[PDB]
Amino acid sequence: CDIHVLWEWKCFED
Amino acid sequence: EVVKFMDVYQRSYCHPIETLVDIFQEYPDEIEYIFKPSCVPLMRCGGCCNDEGLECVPTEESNITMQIMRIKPHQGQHIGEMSFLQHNKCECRPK
Amino acid sequence: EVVKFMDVYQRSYCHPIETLVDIFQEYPDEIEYIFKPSCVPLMRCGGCCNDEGLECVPTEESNITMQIMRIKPHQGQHIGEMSFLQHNKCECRPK
Numbered sequence: 001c002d003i004h005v006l007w008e009w010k011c012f013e014d
Numbered sequence: 015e016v017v018k019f020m021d022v023y024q025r026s027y028c029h030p031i032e033t034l035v036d037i038f039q040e041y042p043d044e045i046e047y048i049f050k051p052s053c054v055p056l057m058r059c060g061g062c063c064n065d066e067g068l069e070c071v072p073t074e075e076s077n078i079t080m081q082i083m084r085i086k087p088h089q090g091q092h093i094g095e096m097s098f099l100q101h102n103k104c105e106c107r108p109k
Numbered sequence: 110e111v112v113k114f115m116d117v118y119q120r121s122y123c124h125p126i127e128t129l130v131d132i133f134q135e136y137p138d139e140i141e142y143i144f145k146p147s148c149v150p151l152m153r154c155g156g157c158c159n160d161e162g163l164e165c166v167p168t169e170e171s172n173i174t175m176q177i178m179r180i181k182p183h184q185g186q187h188i189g190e191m192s193f194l195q196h197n198k199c200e201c202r203p204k
Contacts, residue, residue: 003064004106006027009020012145012178016190019176026129026146034121034155051121053157060129062148081114095111 028070030101031060037082040098050083056100063106074103121156123165125196128153132177135193145178151193158201169198 001011036053038045056078059070082096130151132144151173154165177191 004068006024007064012019012023015174017173017175019178019188022149022175022177023146025150026148031127031129034126034157036157048161050159051118051157052159052161053121054117055120061150062129062131062146064145066147078112079110080112080117082117083114093114 026061028059028061028063028104028106030057030072030104032056033058033060035098037096046086048085050085054080054082054098056098057102059101059104061104065106067109068106069109070104071107072101072103073105074101076100076102118159123154123156123158123199123201125152125167125199126155127151128155130193132191136191139179142179142181149175149177149193152195152197154196154199156199160201162203163201164204165199166202167196167198168200169196171195171197 001007001014032055034053035056035058037049038052059072061070063070076099077097078100079095079097081093084092084094127150129148130153131148133140133147135149136142154167156165158165171194172192173195174190174192176188179187179189
């Protein structure tokens with residue numbers, strides 16, 4: 001989940 | 015009645031957004047005259063990045079031309095083309 | 110190829126517009142926190158009144174509630190509801 005790009009939910013729950 | 019997390023996060027993430035910009039701001043040497051309208055709508059990069067060390071910056075830009083009125087006191091009304099910078103694509107980049 | 114005057118004028122004139130606002134500006138007693146996203150999209154008055162005697166101001170407001178991630182020292186990641194002020198109507202009034 002690279003920080004330079006818009007994220008999916010999986011990036012936050014983890 | 016409550017905006018869900020992913021919808022707010024996606025809508026606020028770095029992207030071009032219509033912004034209302036005062037013409038004097040774009041062109042501060044022009045603050046001697048009076049423009050109508052006095053502000054224009056421009057696509058400009060806006061919103062937030064996943065981290066405070068990143069900033070939302072344009073990666074594609076273009077000029078847009080608009081019909082604007084300009085006057086000086088006791089002096090004729092003018093209408094002419096004026097050009098402004100627009101942002102077409104934005105990305106989160108280190109500062 | 111050129112945006113026409115009346116189109117520019119109508120699009121620029123005082124009205125509620127989606128504006129990206131930093132959460133800290135809206136919650137100044139929580140500047141100890143880190144929020145994700147760090148900014149939220151809100152309807153706020155913007156644009157011009159084309160009279161330097163006048164300013165664009167809200168005349169009708171409401172709240173909207175959004176899910177925001179919140180973390181602070183000695184705390185882990187939380188998600189919680191945060192309320193924000195929106196502008197529903199705007200008008201040009203003397204300054």
